[PDB]
Amino acid sequence: SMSTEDAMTVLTPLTEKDYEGLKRVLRSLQAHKMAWPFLEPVDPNDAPDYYGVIKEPMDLATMEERVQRRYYEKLTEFVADMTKIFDNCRYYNPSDSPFYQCAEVLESFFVQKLKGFKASRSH
Binding site for ligand W2W (CB under 6 A): 37, 40, 42-43, 46-48, 89, 92-93, 99
Nearer CB in complex with ligand W2W: 10/48? 48
**Least distance in Å: CB of 94 to ligand W2W?**
6
C-alpha 47/C-alpha 93 separation (Å) is 10
Q: CA 108 to CA 65: how far, in whole Å? A: 23
Residue 28 CB, nearest approach to ligand W2W (Å): 19
**Rounded to the nearest 10 degrees, how much is the dihedral formed by the CA atoms of 22, 13, 78, 28?**
10
Q: Which is nearer to ligand W2W, 92 or 110 (CB)?
A: 92
Closer Cβ to ligand W2W, 34 or 111, answer by number: 34
Q: How far apart are CA 115 and CA 15, in angstroms?
A: 18
CB 61 within 8 A of CB 40: yes
Nearer to ligand W2W, 19 or 99 (CB): 99
107, burial (CB in 10 Å: exposed 0-12, middle 13-18, buried 19+): buried
